[PDB]
Amino acid sequence: VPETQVSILDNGLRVASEQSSHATCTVGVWIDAGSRYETEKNNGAGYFLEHLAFKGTKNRPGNALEKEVESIGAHLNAYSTREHTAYLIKALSKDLPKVVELLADIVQNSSLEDSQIEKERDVILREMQENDASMQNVVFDYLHATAFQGTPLAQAVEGPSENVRRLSRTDLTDYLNRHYKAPRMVLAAAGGVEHQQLLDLAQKHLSSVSPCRFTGSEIRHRDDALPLAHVAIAVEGPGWANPDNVTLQVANAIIGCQSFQTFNISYSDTGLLGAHFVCDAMSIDDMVFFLQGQWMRLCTSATESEVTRGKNILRNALVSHLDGTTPVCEDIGRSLLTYGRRIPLAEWESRIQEVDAQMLRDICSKYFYDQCPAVAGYGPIEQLPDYNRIRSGMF
Amino acid sequence: TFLRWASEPEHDHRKRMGLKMLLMMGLLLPLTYAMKRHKWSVLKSRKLAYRPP
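ok -> structure tokens follow
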């Protein structure tokens, strides 16, 4: 697998690339700026700037931005999490000169038209009025909240409607001018790109860029008119950099009622490790029990075969050139923002093959057993057991 | 005194039990109260909020 080569410019912006023989490329800008860096007076600034970032910059007033990035034939995407913001474009590699330039203006000298500002306010607000339809997102945004209380991590990426209505260009300008610093930025490229050409384009454009504690808790939004119930139970994830994350991923691969997914969400030295399941009310209790059993099961039933199993499924999850440019870029941007380097797949394979059953049950015992859980329920959740009961697996 | 002693040949025996009982209850009542207040704190801190849509 070709190595990911990283350079660093005057601004501090990093320029990471991973050349591949695929023909198109996914060039993106990551920024270490999310809802964790907001201070409850600008709780929707990143989301609302993510809406305003494609509505024209001085150089591209009006629909120019979308038009050109449309004409070139590229797909323009952006997303925001609690810790990272990404503005990425997938286009024909021959379009690199075009691409970099457009992206530059997106992350700098973006001209928020107050006309649009008002418009987006409405968009965000109205969607939020309906964002309630995404029960799963709801469950996952209180889980974050209930656990990370009194901590920036709690505030959702979207932010409270209140703030959405009460936001102004200057505030946005601040978030933009405060959390868009060049040392906290990665220009990541994946696919048919040359690293020297991308470094020269980053020098030509973009060379101008200038606590958290886990709280055991439970939030039971009871609404009996909903047909199905969604319940998430989590404990404190190790973090992004913690080595044991890998032995925890294998544990998730061992676990894999209904829609019983498993998650290991990682933030800067914290996270949520757990399971989300949707079930008819009458079975919620049973399901809860099962999940708990499985976790302690890892603590007691790490059959080597299953250990291997989990390792293998993890082995087939690692992202690679095969997965495509975007998947890879995305990994390059997150790796330079979180680890400070791109971890190659050989190092991931070494960290997977060093995992055995004994260290898996050791790492699991440290995190699942005797760890107050964070419970978030939504729907007909009367038969969902209360905390004393949940924390008390007793088996 | 003798008559009393005979009427309750166990007067002394008992009072020693009663002393051990008072010491054991003085040890055990606040500890069981603390457990109960642990397992009942959860609810006693529960905050309810009504959020009609």
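The CA atoms of residues 285 and 384 of chain A lie 5 Å apart.
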